[PDB]
Design a protein around this motif. Structure first.
Motif, mmCIF file in Angstrom:
data_model
loop_
_atom_site.group_PDB
_atom_site.id
_atom_site.type_symbol
_atom_site.label_atom_id
_atom_site.label_comp_id
_atom_site.label_asym_id
_atom_site.label_seq_id
_atom_site.Cartn_x
_atom_site.Cartn_y
_atom_site.Cartn_z
ATOM 1 N N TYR A 50 71.187 -87.540 74.575
ATOM 2 C CA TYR A 50 71.532 -88.096 75.956
ATOM 3 C C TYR A 50 73.020 -88.802 75.738
ATOM 4 O O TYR A 50 74.362 -88.931 74.228
ATOM 5 C CB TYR A 50 70.504 -89.047 75.253
ATOM 6 N N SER A 52 74.496 -92.972 77.104
ATOM 7 C CA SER A 52 74.383 -94.668 77.063
ATOM 8 C C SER A 52 75.629 -95.427 76.994
ATOM 9 O O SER A 52 76.596 -94.720 77.177
ATOM 10 C CB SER A 52 73.534 -94.943 75.939
ATOM 11 N N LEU A 56 76.531 -97.219 82.498
ATOM 12 C CA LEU A 56 75.599 -97.158 82.461
ATOM 13 C C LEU A 56 74.205 -97.887 82.129
ATOM 14 O O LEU A 56 74.140 -98.287 82.207
ATOM 15 C CB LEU A 56 74.993 -95.994 81.745
ATOM 16 N N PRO A 57 73.109 -97.845 83.417
ATOM 17 C CA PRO A 57 71.849 -98.751 83.396
ATOM 18 C C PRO A 57 71.351 -98.549 82.212
ATOM 19 O O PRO A 57 70.944 -99.454 81.666
ATOM 20 C CB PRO A 57 71.156 -98.771 84.867
ATOM 21 N N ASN A 58 70.964 -97.787 81.572
ATOM 22 C CA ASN A 58 70.421 -96.781 80.508
ATOM 23 C C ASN A 58 70.606 -95.579 80.488
ATOM 24 O O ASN A 58 71.474 -94.848 81.054
ATOM 25 C CB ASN A 58 68.714 -97.538 80.122
ATOM 26 N N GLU A 59 69.721 -94.925 79.249
ATOM 27 C CA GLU A 59 70.424 -94.146 79.277
ATOM 28 C C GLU A 59 70.237 -92.799 80.237
ATOM 29 O O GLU A 59 68.830 -92.741 80.410
ATOM 30 C CB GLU A 59 69.399 -93.305 77.317
ATOM 31 N N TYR A 60 70.947 -91.497 79.567
ATOM 32 C CA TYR A 60 70.490 -90.722 80.657
ATOM 33 C C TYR A 60 70.991 -89.385 79.689
ATOM 34 O O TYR A 60 71.139 -89.273 78.858
ATOM 35 C CB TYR A 60 71.603 -89.709 81.958
ATOM 36 N N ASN A 96 68.594 -89.234 84.586
ATOM 37 C CA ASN A 96 67.763 -90.423 84.629
ATOM 38 C C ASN A 96 66.294 -90.909 84.145
ATOM 39 O O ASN A 96 65.602 -90.594 85.364
ATOM 40 C CB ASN A 96 67.870 -90.899 86.001
ATOM 41 N N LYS A 98 64.441 -91.884 82.853
ATOM 42 C CA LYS A 98 63.596 -93.609 81.807
ATOM 43 C C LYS A 98 62.647 -93.770 83.397
ATOM 44 O O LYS A 98 62.047 -94.256 83.878
ATOM 45 C CB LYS A 98 64.536 -94.679 82.149
ATOM 46 N N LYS A 99 64.167 -93.217 84.655
ATOM 47 C CA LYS A 99 63.188 -93.891 85.712
ATOM 48 C C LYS A 99 62.486 -92.972 86.718
ATOM 49 O O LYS A 99 61.311 -92.826 87.514
ATOM 50 C CB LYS A 99 64.535 -94.558 86.259
ATOM 51 N N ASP A 111 71.112 -92.455 92.073
ATOM 52 C CA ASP A 111 71.340 -92.335 90.375
ATOM 53 C C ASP A 111 70.463 -91.446 89.199
ATOM 54 O O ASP A 111 70.369 -92.012 88.240
ATOM 55 C CB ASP A 111 70.688 -94.545 90.319
#
Length: 230
Positions: A50, A52, A56-60, A96, A98-99, A111
């Motif tokens: 990943y 991060s 970045l808003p969070n890890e991809y 993404n 996470k999302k 995103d």
């Protein structure tokens, strides 16, 4: 409107932002599973890894690697920087997780995807890390082929020596989805013989032909697309 990719990056027009910290790249757990000749390009599929940090808003999470080249060693990348084309281009696709539930859901949102570009530069230097990939090409000569990637391979060994980057909101190269790009201007160095082996690969069926080139010509930058430099 959408910004179609790839583009020429005009460095004098790029802008600064405090958000652009260095990326945190975590390919420790990355393992290639299979390699494919899709009839267009070489794709390597990964499990693990990943990115991060940065903006970045969070890890991809890492999903796949794509390789592009041209007919001649001096003209093969998708992106350009100040109208300079490199010998070729690796793209590392991340999504993404996470999302969103799958890469397919992620693709539907601006995103959802982040794609890293690593340029290839032919410079009479046999690259032992890139050779891991070259040494799998014999197994995927025909179009729409797949093979296990058996060799141990550490993806972080293909990272450029310096990791400053440009970033913009564009699309995937096939334009099926929006994507944010992270483009490292510092290339990795390879040998002409290494790049040559990609041109042995065959296209889909008149009859199949050698994939002597597979880069996509650049699209004009929309007036409201901003390019940031870290």
């Amino acid at each position: 409107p959408q910004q179609l990719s790839p583009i020429n990056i005009e460095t004098k027009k790029a802008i600064s932002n405090a958000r652009l910290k260095p990326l945190d790249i975590h390919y420790n757990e990355s393992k290639p599973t299979t390699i494919q000749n899709t009839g267009k390009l070489v794709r390597i599929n990964f499990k693990g890894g990943y990115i991060s940090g940065g903006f970045l808003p969070n890890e991809y999470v890492l999903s796949s690697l794509h390789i592009y080249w041209g007919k001649e060693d001096d003209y093969g990348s998708n992106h350009l920087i100040d109208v300079y084309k490199y010998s070729g281009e690796i793209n590392l696709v991340h999504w993404n997780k996470k999302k969103y539930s799958s890469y397919e859901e992620a693709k539907k949102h601006d995103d959802g995807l982040i794609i890293i570009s690593i340029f290839l530069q032919v410079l009479d230097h046999k690259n032992v890390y890139f050779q891991k990939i070259v040494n799998q090409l014999d197994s995927i000569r025909s179009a729409n082929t797949s093979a296990p990637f058996d060799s141990v391979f550490y993806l972080d060994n293909l990272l450029p020596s310096k990791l400053d980057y440009f970033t913009y909101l564009g699309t995937t190269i096939n334009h099926s989805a929006d994507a944010v790009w992270i483009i490292f201007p510092t290339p990795i160095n390879i040998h002409s013989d290494q790049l040559s082996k990609f041109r042995t690969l065959l296209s889909l069926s008149g009859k199949p032909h050698y994939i002597t080139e597979n880069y996509r010509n650049p699209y004009k930058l929309n007036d409201d697309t901003e390019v940031y430099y870290s």
